[PDB]
DNA sequence: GGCGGCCGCTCTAGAACAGGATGTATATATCTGACACGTGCCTGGAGACTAGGGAGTAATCCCCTTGGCGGTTAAAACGCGGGGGACAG
């Protein structure tokens, strides 16, 4: 057992990748789902939230 | 001596302009009520491991879309007549 690391704080991002991974695999949307998809969504959502909340 | 033309005078009205009216834009005074910081947890993701399976990639294949023609008759396009309707009033 290593240091805990988030993938947020690894991406440079502030959503969590966890949890966004965590609500695809039990949200039945697919029965794989991959390292990158996360990150992905965490990173868009970030953007959509940052933008919304700048204007 | 009568009459058309010309210019001044007064009447009338469009419109720029200033003053009153009332519902909001602000300047504090103060309430106030959630906002975010702190604390205490504790419950879900991460390091690490086991195993395996579906795609990355290579190969084939056969298939099906693109280019590329004449032909020919359906039709786009130009134009004349005109006709009923969009819009100003």
């Known amino acids: 057992?290593?240091?805990a690391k988030?993938?947020?704080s690894r991406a440079g991002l502030q959503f969590p990748?966890?949890?966004v991974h965590r609500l695809l695999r039990?949200?039945?949307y697919a029965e794989r789902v991959?390292?990158?998809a996360p990150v992905y969504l965490a990173?868009?959502?970030e953007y959509l939230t940052?933008?919304?909340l700048e204007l």
């Open 1 to 3: 057992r290593a240091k």
């Open 6 to 8: 988030t993938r947020s």
């Open 17 to 19: 990748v966890g949890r």
């Open 26 to 28: 039990k949200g039945n």
């Open 34 to 36: 991959g390292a990158g």
């Open 43 to 45: 990173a868009v959502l």
């Open 50 to 52: 940052a933008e919304i």
